[PDB]
Design a protein around this ligand. Structure first.
Ligand code: ZN
Ligand code: ZN
Ligand code: ZN
Ligand code: ZN
Ligand code: ZN
Ligand code: ZN
Ligand code: ZN
Ligand code: ZN
Lengths: 76, 298
């Protein structure tokens, strides 16, 4: 299935993904498309920050639904 | 219309429909699993490892049941095809009016408050639509951006966010964005003050100098250009009480005796001496396999 990753900027990324994919695997797909380090990536769905350990199916995230990408900036 | 399960079907229906309840082995995920105790509430279905049983897959030593759902408006495609349970949506079999417009609608939305207030779906749309525009949704630490009962009752927060799929797609897309924005704000994070860029940034605990992805360097505390030092500068109780979810008898198909529903389960065994018939409360006939799928409880 494909999901959307959207930032509050308005930039939208399409990701071919599986429900059994961990968020960590999703982050890698974003880095492969935008170069953003996973350490600076943080995905939020319905106001909940997704943890890398859990998968997409655990959050009942459906096809053609959108995750939100928010940056984690340090140092105032 | 004998369905008691409502789901959201993303593909291919992209809408809310009636749903079929299924059960498989929690261990090996094979559809052949026999349940020992019928589900009586949504907690039996949603909570994990709550009901034991037997797995018909040879060799498998699994004990617990896994309940999932399918859309009942399109033929299943693959074993992976599943739907999301919208547990708060129920059949208004009690003919309970809405707390807002006092209409006897069907189906309805019943909040999980200790008091179980009831709303029709249209009022629910208007309830969410209004409270979204006024940034009145709460930013829950466990459930995310959500809403409680309109009466504001304890422990009534919506947990399955796909209930908001009852809303317009524009509102739902807005719901998620607002969800992200106030997630940032509640987490101590910041939103880039730039007009062209309102990036969501999770800054450090004590960070003044924030530099967004757009390159703009601004103050985290006052949201202005970066600097040093100090930053310069309606519910009617009459309606609500009547619109309350929290006597009724039906004859047995095998002996015509008067029977009352004990719990939430629809699978009923006649308590009469001569007749131990397995029958369904909804169909007023014999307990079939589709009764499990269409209306096992509720
Ligand atoms: Zn469907
Ligand atoms: Zn099994
Ligand atoms: Zn109403
Ligand atoms: Zn309430
Ligand atoms: Zn910016
Ligand atoms: Zn300042
Ligand atoms: Zn009987
Ligand atoms: Zn039935």
């Amino acid at each position: 299935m494909q999901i959307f990753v959207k930032t509050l900027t308005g930039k939208t990324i399409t990701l071919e993904v599986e429900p059994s994919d961990t968020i960590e695997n999703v982050k890698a797909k974003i880095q492969d498309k935008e170069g953003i380090p996973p350490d600076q990536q943080r995905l939020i769905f319905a106001g909940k920050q997704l943890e890398d350990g859990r998968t997409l199916s655990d959050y009942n995230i459906q096809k053609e639904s959108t995750l939100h990408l928010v940056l984690r900036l340090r140092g105032x | 219309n004998k369905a008691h399960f409502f789901i959201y079907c993303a593909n291919p229906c992209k809408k809310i429909n009636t749903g079929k309840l299924r059960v498989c082995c929690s261990e090996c995920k094979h559809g052949a699993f026999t349940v020992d105790t019928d589900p009586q509430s949504w907690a039996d279905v949603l909570d994990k490892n709550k009901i034991t049983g037997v797995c018909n897959n040879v060799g498998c030593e699994g004990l617990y049941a896994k309940f999932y759902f399918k859309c009942a408006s399109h033929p299943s495609q693959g074993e992976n095809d599943t739907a999301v349970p919208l547990n708060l949506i129920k059949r208004n079999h009690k003919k309970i009016p809405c707390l807002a417009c006092t209409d006897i609608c069907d189906p309805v939305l019943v909040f999980s408050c200790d008091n179980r207030h009831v709303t029709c779906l249209e009022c629910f749309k208007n309830y969410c639509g209004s409270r979204l525009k006024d940034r009145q949704f709460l930013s829950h630490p466990d459930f995310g951006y959500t809403l409680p009962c309109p009466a504001g009752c304890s422990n009534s927060f919506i947990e399955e966010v796909h209930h908001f799929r009852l809303l317009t797609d524009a509102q739902y897309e807005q719901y998620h964005r607002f969800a992200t924005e106030e997630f940032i704000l509640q987490a101590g994070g910041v939103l880039c003050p730039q007009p062209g860029c309102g990036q969501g940034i999770l800054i450090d605990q004590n960070c003044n100098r924030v530099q967004c992805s757009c390159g703009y360097v601004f103050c985290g505390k006052c949201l202005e250009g970066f600097h040093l030092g100090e930053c310069l500068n309606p519910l009617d109780p009459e309606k609500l009480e009547k619109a309350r979810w929290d006597v009724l008898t039906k004859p047995c198909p095998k002996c015509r005796t008067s029977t009352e529903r004990a719990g939430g389960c629809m699978h009923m065994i006649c308590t009469r001496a001569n007749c131990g018939f397995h029958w369904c409360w909804v169909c007023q006939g014999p307990w079939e396999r589709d009764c499990m799928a269409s209306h096992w409880f509720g």
